[PDB]
From Swiss-Prot, chains A, B:
Cytoplasmic side of membrane: 1-305
Subcellular location, record wording: Host cytoplasm; Host Golgi apparatus; Host nucleus
Residues of the full protein shown: 3264 to 3568 of 7096
Activity regulation statement: Inhibited by pyridone-containing alpha-ketoamides compounds 13a and 13b. In turn, alpha-ketoamide 13b (tert-butyl (1-((S)-1-(((S)-4-(benzylamino)-3,4-dioxo-1-((S)-2-oxopyrrolidin-3-yl)butan-2-yl)amino)-3-cyclopropyl-1-oxopropan-2-yl)-2-oxo-1,2-dihydropyridin-3-yl)carbamate) inhibits SARS-CoV-2 replication in human lung cells. Inhibited ex vivo by michael acceptor inhibitor N3. Inhibited ex vivo by compound 11a and 11b.
Organism: Severe acute respiratory syndrome coronavirus 2 (2019-nCoV)
Annotated protein name in UniProt: 3C-like proteinase nsp5
Mutagenesis / variant outcome for changing residue 189 to A: Does not affect ability to cleave and inactivate human TRMT1
Active site: 41, 145
Domain of life the protein comes from: Viruses
Amino acid sequence: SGFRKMAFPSGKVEGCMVQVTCGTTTLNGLWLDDVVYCPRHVICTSEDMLNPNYEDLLIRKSNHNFLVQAGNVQLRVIGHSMQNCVLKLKVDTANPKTPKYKFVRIQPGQTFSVLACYNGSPSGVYQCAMRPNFTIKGSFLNGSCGSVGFNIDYDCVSFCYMHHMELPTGVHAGTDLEGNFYGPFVDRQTAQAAGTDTTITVNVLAWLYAAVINGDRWFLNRFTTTLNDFNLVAMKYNYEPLTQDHVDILGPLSAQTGIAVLDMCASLKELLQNGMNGRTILGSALLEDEFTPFDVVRQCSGVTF
Amino acid sequence: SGFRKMAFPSGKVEGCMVQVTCGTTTLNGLWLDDVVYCPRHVICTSEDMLNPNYEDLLIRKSNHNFLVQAGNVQLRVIGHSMQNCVLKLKVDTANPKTPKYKFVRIQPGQTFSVLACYNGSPSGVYQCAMRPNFTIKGSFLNGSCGSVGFNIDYDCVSFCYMHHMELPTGVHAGTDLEGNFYGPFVDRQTAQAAGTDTTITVNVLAWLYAAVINGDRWFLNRFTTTLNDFNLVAMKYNYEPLTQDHVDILGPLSAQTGIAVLDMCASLKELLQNGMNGRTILGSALLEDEFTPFDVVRQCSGVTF
């Protein structure tokens, strides 16, 4: 038993991380097959970031301007191209440690593991969620750009995130591996508005189910509610509305605990209106929304890779 | 910026994990050089665990009773011996993926990463602390025994924990890699008392320092206090007393923030007596004690491996 915010094992990704340097900018890159992916702002100076013209800047760079370094093994760039906001550095050597991988664009509310890197070297791994406003609340210092987020399913690494920038508000924004930003942000040093950050209701429900599984049931009540009535209260507390798709996804947790989704909604409703009275659930005094229903099932069944 | 409960990258350890089977018990083992380490209760049945005589049970087992499996590669046991509560299985093949490693016995309040495994396969990685009562609050399902905890310093893996048992209270107990239990527990299925679980005060202080670094400073006040006066209040709230050794360890955080240790103690004192008023610090409504001063420095300076 027990419940922890658990990250995927990072071994398969550690062996894909490289240091990319262009001029005096050094950040992290993702080396898969004979290609290296990295944020395109590696080519900018500090002055450039205020208002970069990436096409103009990229034309004054040649293949030999990019220094890719994998441990003490230098790679040779024999082709470069810009795809959206990522630079694709074609190199002479295919990474022998390339895993079975794919690129996926995740939806808000989904979780993934982040391997924080500096100078192409792993530093730490943590689990986080894509917020509904398409930001993440990570831990990134300068030179972490190029760090990637990922999920593992069986033997296949799903890369879903590349870190690009920290907003003046201290939250983090990045792209998928095709270079398309999550959210309306752009890779330029300017004030950019993130939208309201709402709470991922379906994830809260999965976490409450995890609590019941681990013996925390003080919050249960025999009240019930309707999906419409619940959403009216959820909307007022900046909780994402719940849909029938969310109810379906929680079915397996409903079956294992004998507690209907709408009954659990009624217990959450009470918590929002009356608070936690200084009590806790799974060691937390706040409602947690960084566990998907799949995460809970995964951790309460014992899945390996 | 930002602050996360961050685990070490687990790659170096993933390649050391193997499945050990003896009779009908299968759990995880640690394969380093030509030796496999695993909990000695692998040799027990369910009935045996109530009152095991490990010397008697180990004599009815021979080298060929142990099935060590590393992926699809079977290892051959050519020698076995019991060291305290761990079984050492000497095998014919040295692990080519053996890292630079050492065995260390950690003190309460220190943190380490856990690689949760099942059938010798990694499942997830999380960061936790050794509680002052020598338990850990992990996430373990049956068959996780043999999972290990570890720290990484530069290139060297420090193995510090091997999981053995879940107590009837839902907390977790295990040994160092020499087979000596942390705490007064024994590997037998009986009611065992864990002591009072106190809060790791020095870690709370480091976390509050991390908060100030990341812009959360509402809890600061210009009051001060004495080490003796602080400990009087800490003792009442089941907080570990603070010593001069703890003050010294926090010096570097004191210097970077311009806030004396005793001033920060005064701010914590107020929090214990008056609570958090529903506010939060670094996204938490509770005082966090699973970050050592070294963890905070590591995460706020950008250390790699």
